[model samples]
Structure formats: structure tokens, C-alpha cells
Target chain A: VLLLDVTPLSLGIETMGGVMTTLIAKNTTIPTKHSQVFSTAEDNQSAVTIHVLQGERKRAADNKSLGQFNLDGINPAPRGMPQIEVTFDIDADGILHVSAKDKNSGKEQKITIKASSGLNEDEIQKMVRDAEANAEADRKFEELVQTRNQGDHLLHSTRKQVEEAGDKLPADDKTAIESALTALETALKGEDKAAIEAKMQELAQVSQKLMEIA
Target chain B: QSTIALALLPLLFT
Candidate 1:
């Protein structure tokens, strides 16, 4: 979840002078939305030219422009007449989209800003698939360790109880205990879990007899 | 010397 949600901001275009400025930074958050307001630099400018750029640079001219659109509804009021509000929303997969609106007229403009570089939907899906596979492998490893501990503890504790009761048990019961111990020790050293389980059953029968006598 | 008496004297007895 952390890898999927934490997105980076990257400029889509590259500059010849290597001084391109980026619209979004890499490692930016996914499903992110932000807005910026700009005013016309010159007076009597009927339409403002808006250029969407992607890249890190000192100047706007050096970066690759994803798309270009004009901001309408400029008044050319004595000095700065046009005010454009640009809104950007990056989806969960880090695709950049843009929308512009005139603050006074409430007119809205939308553009799909294609970047020079960005991961497609298919690539993101593959990354998630790999993450799931690693999680499953880790889960199975922990389960194997847990199951081995349970069997190991049972074998150790049962052998301890049998040895601790030495000489006190009756002759027939002691012989039975000895047979169980031999079988259990042989099975414990081997790789067969089912054989160990059978030996466990045999040991339990003698243990029950010893309990009755105690 | 007093600090050594309290802290290091155990080493001599051991």
C-alpha cells in the first residue's frame, strides 16, 4: 500500500540545456490534486498561452512541454487583465491531467497532458503482482517455522517426562516406555513427520499407564 | 583511591 500510494513528481520532458523545470516532482503522493493561479505578464494580451511542462530545470523554456492551450476571457484591463487558475490531479497510477478555469467567468477548460515519460497501467499491475508473490513466500516460511516448533517441543517434553520417572515405573511399564523412547528417537532424527506422529501415539499409551500408577 | 577501593576491591578477593 505504501509503494502504491506514494507517487513521485517527475518532469515528462528533457531540455537541451539541461535546465528544464518540472510541473510535478517525482515520489509525489498518488490520487493527488493541486491548483495554481497565474496572471498575464503583459497588458492588452487577449489570450494567455499556457504551457504544461514536465522536468526539473531553472527555466520554463528548457523543459519539454506536454501540451499547450490558450486561456480565454482576458480583459486586458490597463495592465494585467487575465487570471487563470490551473488545477492538476494525478491519478493513483501517477498519470497527470490538467484543468483550467477563469476565476471571473467560471468557464472551465480540460486537457489530458501527455508527458514525455510515465508508467502505463500495465506496468503498475505487474509491480503489484510481484509484491503479492513475495508476501505469499514470506507467509509460508513463517508457517513452516511455527509447525516445526510445535512438533519439536512435543518430542522434547515427552522424552523428558519418560526419563524423569526412571525406576519408579513397574517393569512392564518401564519396558513399554523404553520401546517408545527408541522409536521416537529414531523418528525424530529422520525427515518423516507422519512416522514421528505414530511414535508420539505409541509414547502416549505408555505415559497414560504411568499416570495411572502415579 | 576510594573509588578504586569500592569498585576494584572485588577483583582482588575473586
Candidate 2:
């Protein structure tokens, strides 16, 4: 598990579920990445602290505030004029990293978060890379199985056709039956579905020839 | 609706 990013929300506190609520929620997936929109409450306030916390508790103080980060340089317009985009990305390893940007001014700020398992930046990146590689390998293996199954299905269908034809066809068609089985067995190792389908079609053709010979 | 849901439920995902 590697830490990829962190984001924050700009909205202030409000009451929810009969309790005072702040910017963050709990039991949501961590290394969670999402953007929050917020506007200045006071006119000409140049900066604000985006308070972030973690836990299932209702109150902000009750939760473990991972940290309070700052967003600066509001355009100092009338209240609710500046909008800040706070983005958070948590990695599979459970590290919360955050970035904030002024949507209008395009100013950006980012901060790194400590992982629960003490994963460094390099370690996090490595984990992410390994995870992605493993996922790809699993997908390819599944495709390989499907390809093999397709080949098997084709072979079965062709065998059925040959059985039905019953020895009235030519000797060349009988040899073609053996050839189809060989090709099918060879195609079973490949994971690409298209490759499997092509081999299966060839197997069917071979079956037809065998039937004609029989 | 309940009967249809129960009968077609498994096929729906497929």
C-alpha cells in the first residue's frame, strides 16, 4: 500500500445528527481522496485552516485530528467570493496526503501525511507499483483460463460433430480431426480472448472436415 | 415484483 495523495474540504462546522459536525467524516475508506469546496465567511480574510480529523466520533475534538493545514491568499473579495479546492488521497497503506488550490487564482499547496505503518514516500510508491503489477498479473491469468476454456469448448463441439457424422467421410478429414485437437491444445495456453476464439473457430472447421470424411 | 426479482436475480448480474 502506497500513499498517493491527500485532499481537504473547505466548509465550516455545522450541526448534524443532533451533534456539532466539522469538515471530515469517519468509516469512509482511508487513504480516501476527495475534494471539498469552501468559501470565506469573513470579507478580506486572506487565509483559513482546513481542520481535518479521523474517527467515528461525532465531535471534532473527540476525533484524532490528523492535522490542521492552512489555505492562504483569498482574493479578499466580499464574503463567499473565493473558492478553495481541497483534495485528499489516502493510499492503500493508510496514509492521508492533502493538497489545496485556489480554483480561481490557481495557487496550490500540498502536504505529506505519515502512514499508520510508517511507510516513507519511496516505500509508498513502491507498494503502489507492486500492487498495480500484481493486479495486472491476476487479470492476465484469468484471461488465460478463459482462453483455455474456449479451446476446450470448441474441441468438445467438434468432437460431437465428428461423432454424429460416423465414418462416412474421407481419410483426409479424419486426419484433420487430430490436427484440430492439437491446435486447440496449443491455443489453450494463451490468455488473449481473441486468440482463443480464433483457435476455437479453426477447431470447428476441422470438425466439419472430419464429419465430411466420415 | 418479488417473484420476478427472486427468479431473475442471479441472471441480472450476468
Candidate 3:
């Protein structure tokens, strides 16, 4: 016998009125555990209303509220000073267990998931598709950031080499690398990601030959 | 050219 374990939606705690601090992201495999630290919003706040939520929306209000519990007895402290550790653990049966603990006092609050998400198989399928699409976009965005970092690093190092190896490099090669550096700097300022990549490749070619001559 | 440039560009300069 085999048991297929999967979470249909994301689970998180509400940090603000409409903001959700996600703990276990949606579509994650079952039997996953995650913990995050939260702080009080105001000074001397004695109690915190832990709002458990489930959904894929970015806003807390847009998601489904699973349940809520209170973690009182927090050692009265200033806003953003006291630490609350919230943990979400999902078991193989697709059940969710949430717990919150006050770091200083060790006082804890726990709850099991109970709420109506009203999601049928069709809705779940649609959600999976949407999540996959968003994941793809996020992957692309991360790739672009990495590419930009690589280009910037090369540009900085190449410029430094040109500056320090002034007499070491042949005059023509040095001029080529310097011009390439200037062009890359300008290219980076534009919003076109592919253009920046192309400029970096162009600069890399010039730097490669210059290194051989030096 | 693409693979070689990317791999060797930094190594060459440094």
C-alpha cells in the first residue's frame, strides 16, 4: 500500500491585517516542516492572535482562514522586541499541525487545521497550473538577477585590471577593454535583460583576448 | 566561442 501525500494550498501566519508571512508554501510535498520568527507589533503587547491561513494569494485577506489561537503570557516587551517562533508541520495524511512558542517564556500554543477551503478537484487542478506558471516566472526572474550580477562583477574586475595593468597591456588591447567596460556599464542601465547579456558577452570576448596578450 | 569566452574571460584577466 502506498499513500500519496500532498498539500493543496500554502499555509502561513498573518503578520499584518492583509499581509501573510508564509511558512509552508503551497504545492509542497507532504511531511514538510518549517519555522519562522515573528515579533510583536507594539510595546507591552501581552497577547498575540495567531491567524492561520491557507491559500496562494499574496494578501492574507484573499486567502482562506484555517483557524486562530492566542499565544498570551508573552513577557511584556517593546514592539518588535519579543520573539515568537511559529512552526507548521504537515503529516502524511494531509493534516496540518501548527504551533507557536514564546522564545523567552517557552509558552506555546498549538492547533490542528480545520477550515473549509471549498476547493474541488477542478479548482485544485487550476491552482496547480497557476502555481506552476508563477514558479516559472520566478525562476526566470532569479536567472536574470544572476546574469546581471555576473555581468556587473566582470565589468568591475575588468575595469580594475585595465586601470592597474596600464603599462603591462598593449595599448590597443587596453583601449579595447576600456571601451568594452564603458559599453557594458551603459548597457546595464537599460531595462532590456537580453541586451545586457549580449553586451556582457561582447565585453567578455574583448577581455579574453586582452588577457592573452598581457 | 560563447562557452570558451564565458569560462576563460575572468581567468584570463585575473
Candidate 4:
């Protein structure tokens, strides 16, 4: 009876390489906190400018910048010693609250962002298509061929529709179907041949009441 | 038959 939102992609920080380091990742279960302690790039660096971003790229500047903070007047420390800590909190309502804390000075700088539920239908479809494309490129099984395809078929038609329908369907039915799909992705679509047969038949009941909605 | 998915019981996530 509870509904929650998911971050479609990573929310990250600038490690000034502009190295992009993800603090909150895509598809996280939500309302989670991720923090990492980082050191200064240069010897005796006292001021670290923290930049926040969102994307899936290797370079931090390649992604979309959300906000930034300057944590100045730190206890001048060596390059490898952890000085400033970056913290990310994706709140209950999808608001991302980020902070940079200097343990020495007990100073904290914060930023908030609000782009949860950002992906459109086209994006979802694109993700599905890309996932299917990748799945086929490495497929090399005879027995798995048919079973895997069935799992993909269910995912393609039902999960796509379920995603589009957006909770109007029976919540229980939706929940179980998603759980089955989770199993399908982890096992059936996963690498082992036995994994495919494991769920293709079991998911039949998952298929049974899954179409309960018009 | 559906009960068979419980085969790789621990591997459900492990």
C-alpha cells in the first residue's frame, strides 16, 4: 500500500578532475544516504570547491551541474589525509539534499535539487530498447534462447505497460509482477542457462493475474 | 511448479 519514487540516473559530485564520482546512483531504492570522504588534490590545500552534478559520464564536467559550494578555511592538511566529506540524501519526496562538511572546522555547506521522476516515456522506451539490444549481443545458448526471449517479451510488453499505467492497476498485482520481473532480470536474463528455465515457467502465474487491468 | 523457483533459494539475492 506504499508508493515510492526512484532516481532514474546518478547524482554525483566534482572531484575536481573534473572527475565524476557518483554519490547517489541511478535506480537506488530511495530515501538513502551516501557519503564519501575525499582528500585534497594538492599539498596544503585549504579550500575545496564542491560541485554537484547528475549524469553517467566519466568526466564530471560532462554531466549537468546542479549546484556548488566552497568549503574554505579548512585545517591545512596533507594531500592524502581525508579532510572534507561529501554527503548526499535523496529525501522522501525526491528532493536531493547534498552537503559538504569539513570535520576540522565543523563547517558545512549544503545544496538541494528537485529533478526526480525526470525521465519521460520516450526515455523509458529507449532504456528498454537498449537493454534488449545489449541482451541479444551476448546471448549464446540454445535452451536459453526461447526461455530468455519469453522473459524479455514479458518485460517488454508488461513492464512497459505497467510503467506507463503508473499505479492505477491493482497494487498487489503490480507488486508481484514487478517482483517476478526482478527475478526474471536477475535469473532468467542473467548468465546461467539454468537460471532461464528457473523462472520462465514459474512466472506463468506472474503472467496469470498480471494482466488483471484493462 | 511455481514452488520450484525456490530452488536457488539462497541465490535469490546471494
Candidate 5:
């Protein structure tokens, strides 16, 4: 099996409180994406300064600043009203691409980390070992997140189907599908991944039958 | 047929 490269340090951005808000944790596999929503601290702020950093520190000052960029051209609005989405993506080559988008105005700024200087071979090797040690737990967490997302999407579509075509399908089929949906919702809250997957499969089968009939 | 036509055409033009 091919070993995966992981982030050597946590990636974060500066927040209003001057805190280092981590977007991606250290030892996360490469080619991963993480985003966080931020808002302005004051009213009528036209621009936002995003300071990209790399390190595992609570304070922004203690971290190594990779770069900083200003996302201008935002529509002036009240503080905490506008949605600013900051996305951090790390590629397989260990390069970082940081982007900030003003969801209100659709304006965006992007930066690529070509060289995260001061990295040596030994440090990367050590981080790789740490990544291998945490791989199992991380994989479990990642799978759960993926399964939950899939369940949500499936439930949304299935609910829409039930709404539009409930009258056409049999009453018993409709009830069974509804019950499965409810069970899936409950299972999503628990830690049993297998139970959630089984419920999702039941939902999918019932929805498919409903589709063929309706 | 088109390939033959183009080949003949080139030869003829030259």
C-alpha cells in the first residue's frame, strides 16, 4: 500500500479575537479540505485581512505566519451579518491553497503556499510517523463524517420524494419508508456506524421501490 | 477517397 503524506503542522487563520483558529489539524492526510465561517467584528468593514499560519498554537502570534492577504470589494454590512467563508486545501505535494470568499458579494481572494520554508527532511519523517500512529482513529472519524453526509443527502431527496409522490405510492410503503427515515435520523446521532449504514440502505431500497411505482 | 484526392491535389499543385 502507498503511504499518504500528511500536514506537518496545523493550518489556521487569524480571527477577530487574534486567536489562531485552526482550519485543519496536524497529521491530517494530504489533499484534504477544511473551511470555517468568519464574520466582521465591526460595522461597515469593507475589507477583511486573513493571516494564514502554520503551527499548533492557541495564540496567533506564536504560530509561523505563512502569508496574509486582504479580501476587499465586500459590500459594507453590519458586523456578524455577512458570511465570510475561508477554505484551506492542502494538495498531495504538501502545498497549501488558502481562499476567502465573501458569500454575500461573491468576491474572493486566493493564495498558494509554494514554499513552506524551514522544513527539513527529519521533521517531515517524524510527522509521517505521527500520522501513521493516528491513522486508524482518524480513518474512523473520517468515515463517519462521510457516511453522515451521505445519509443527510439521501434523506433530503427521499423526503422530497415522499412529499411529492406520497399519494401515488402505497400507504404501507410510504409508512415503511418514513419509519426508516426516522430510524436513520436516530442512528445518525449514535456512534454505531454499521447501524447507520444499515438504516441508510433500507431507506435507499424503499425509496427505489417507491420510485418504480410512482 | 479524400486522402487520395488531397495527395493528388498536392502533387498536381506542385
Candidate 6:
């Protein structure tokens, strides 16, 4: 299947005073490329240092260091006169092929970002799952609230009746009701569905004795 | 905000 992919971060190169001049912004779709013309800023500068980097920072020192090379083939001239064509191309194969050339000298150099990696179906599938599971968690939590709330209401309803019928029922009946109360009440404080269900059944059967009284 | 929260809910705290 054909799926679009975007860059994870910005990619650029070092400039004068360790500045980062961005060639591409973050989250940009790939399998395409761009290039720019750059020149030396100083007179009689014989070469240009190309620092391949990636990040949002404006300073090249703060950005990620991908690779670097010096193009010594420049036609030494005054600032802004050299014709250096820098190319940045990202392929669907998940690699960034960066190349720069001195048009006057006919010299070329290139670097490839392979393991920095490309987008694949694995990443897409996980993101989709995050959206789906996150939605389900909301409903799951609401159902959890009800189950615990059911236990609270059950305990409350029986406690009042069990106390009122304390003298009316014999020791066996009163003791049994209190035991069920303690078990279910404890279950409500925790998140075990098995414990809650087990205690609820026992609590409901004995508490039925107080149902007619209240 | 609603869509953002829905997408990032796994990282959210109750």
C-alpha cells in the first residue's frame, strides 16, 4: 500500500558563526528534495565547510551532528560570488542523500542518512492503535466506575437495615450479615473484579434477610 | 483540545 511519510525533524547545515540555516522544516513530507545556492561570506575564502545537521535549534552547535566535509574546490573569490549548489533529497527508501557541488570547480561530495531511518507501516499502525485504545479506555473507565459504585450502594442499603434488625435477628444471622458487609466493603476499596463479584454474591444472599425488614 | 486529548490519552494522568 502507498502511504505518505513526513520528516521527523528539520534538516539543515552550519553557517557563519555556528548558525543553523534550515533547508527543510520539521514534519515535511518526503520522497522529494530541495536545493539552494550558497556562497562564502569572506573575501579570498578558498573553501566551504558543509555541516550536515538536523534539529529545530537556530545554532548549529545545538543541532544533531549528522556529518561534515570541507569542499576545497571553491573558486576563491570575494564573498557572495561562489556558486555552490547544495542538494537535499529524501527517498521513499528512508534515506537522506545530501550532495553539494562547486559549479566553478566541477567538484562534488555527498553524504547519505540511512539508519537515521525512514517511515514505515509499523509506525503508522501503532499510531492508529493509540487512537483506538485511547477511545476505548474512556468507556472502560466509565464501566469501572459503575461496578465500584454498585458495591457502595449495596453496602449502604444493607448497613442501615442490618443495624435496625440487629436485635430482631439471632446471633447467627447478625454475625453472618456483618461478615458479608466487611468482605464486600473491603472489595470496593480495591480494583479486583473477581473479589468484588464473589463478595457481592455472598453479601446479597445474607442481606436479603433484611430486605423485608426495611 | 478534545482531539488532542483523545490522541494523547495514553500519556495522560487521571
Model 5 lDDT per residue over A78-139, tens place = 55566778899887777888998878778898988874552456765664565467667655
Residue-pair clashes per candidate, as listed? 16, 16, 0, 0, 0, 0
User: What's the C-alpha lDDT at position A95 in model 5?
Assistant: 80
Best by lDDT: 5
After best superposition, candidate 6 residue A70: deviation in angstroms? 1.3
What digit string (tens of lDDT, one per residue) describes model 4 on residues A38-60?
A: 65654466677777766555445
Candidate 3 structure, TM-score to reference: 0.53
**Highest TM-score: which candidate?**
3
Report residue A194 deviation for candidate 2 (angstroms).
67
Model 3 DockQ vs. reference: 0.03
User: Model 4 — interface RMS deviation?
Assistant: 23.1
Provide the DockQ value for model 2. Answer: 0.02
Interface RMSD of each: 36.5, 22.4, 23.2, 23.1, 31.1, 20.2
**Better by lDDT, candidate 5 or 3:** 5
Can you give the DockQ of every candidate in the order shown?
A: 0.01, 0.02, 0.03, 0.03, 0.01, 0.06
Give a tens-digit lDDT track for model 3, residues A1-214.
Answer: 3656567777787654345567987668777999887766555778787788776655456556778888888777755566688889877666778998878788998988743343567776775666566666544554555466567667866776676676878777878878888888887676677988988888888787556645
Ranking by TM-score: 3, 5, 4, 6, 1, 2
The stretch of ten residues in a row with the least summed lDDT in candidate 2 chain A is A10-19
Error of 1 at A155 (Å): 91
- How would you encode candidate 2's per-residue C-alpha lDDT over A27-134 as one tens digit per residue? 355545666655554447687565555433333343345555667766667444566666677677656677767788997767766764233456545644554555
Best by DockQ: 6
TM-score of predicted model 6? 0.49
* Each prediction's RMSD to truth: 30.0, 23.0, 13.4, 20.6, 16.9, 26.1
Q: Proportion of native contacts found in each model?
A: 0.00, 0.00, 0.00, 0.00, 0.00, 0.00
Q: Predicted chain A of model 2: TM-score relative to the true chain A?
A: 0.42
Q: Summarize candidate 6's per-residue lDDT along A1-214 as a digit string, tens digits.
A: 4788777666878764455566777778878788777766555777777788775545456556778777775665744566777789988876888887877777888888784543335643553454355556544444554566567656765776776786887677788889999999889888776687788889888766677664
Which 10-residue window of candidate 3 chain A scores lowest in summed lDDT? A137-146
